[PDB]
């Protein structure tokens, strides 16, 4: 039930080789299959948005959704 608040290399490696194939990436998806905390998931959205691999479709203060580029 409890998730991980820190991201290690064991979780880092799945991202940079898997996010190229997801159709949607959301906080629910990360807490679902990455087995990570929601706050860490939201951070994972924001650090990865600026590196230039995903594009914004709709933005809001409660939930945000991202897709492929």
């Amino acid at each position: 039930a409890q998730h991980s608040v820190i991201l290690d290399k064991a979780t880092s490696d799945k991202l940079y080789k898997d996010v190229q194939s997801y159709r949607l990436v959301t906080v629910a998806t990360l807490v679902d299959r990455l087995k990570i905390n929601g706050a860490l998931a939201r951070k994972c959205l924001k650090d990865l948005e600026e590196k230039g691999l995903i594009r914004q479709v709709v933005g809001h203060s409660k939930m945000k959704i991202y897709t492929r580029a």
Binding site: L24, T26, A28, D32, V58, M63, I65
Partner: protein, 199 residues
Amino acid sequence: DVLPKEVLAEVGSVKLFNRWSYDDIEIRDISLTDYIQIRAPVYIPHSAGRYAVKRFRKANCPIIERLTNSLMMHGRNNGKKLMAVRIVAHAFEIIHLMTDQNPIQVAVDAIVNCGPREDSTRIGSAGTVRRQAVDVSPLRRVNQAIALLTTGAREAAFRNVKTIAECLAEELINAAKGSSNSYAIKKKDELERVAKSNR
């Protein structure tokens, strides 16, 4: 100047919803038309209509607001159309990405396939039931189909880490085909089966 640059792209063309068009409507069956109203497009579902004065005024009415109205239930969600319209629009945006087809293209097939065709009627028998297994009218079929989708989304999202934004979205794509793993189908097959037994 007086119009936003986003809407200036579509204003030149025929009037439609900004994100998605209303053209290329399904050709799948009959007997459900004349009760789903699409001849008059509407930009946003919200509207203060006069459809609750006579019997069949709801037959000539845009579908999207009816879904918004059925989406808000269970005490707490009374009067929040500002919240409902955004949630429904986001649900159409979410379902648009998993399938290149129009969100209304998927939604119409979703409603037309999850409607029960038979139901059991209650006839008194002094403690027993003379269930006659009557058929269901198309208007009641669509009216109950909307209810099943909305209560399915509310039940699924209740006490779950998922949010209703994509929780509502997933049923429309699930119900688009004969997946048989949705709540609406769970109620639908039980109703025809009990009618089949009680014929």
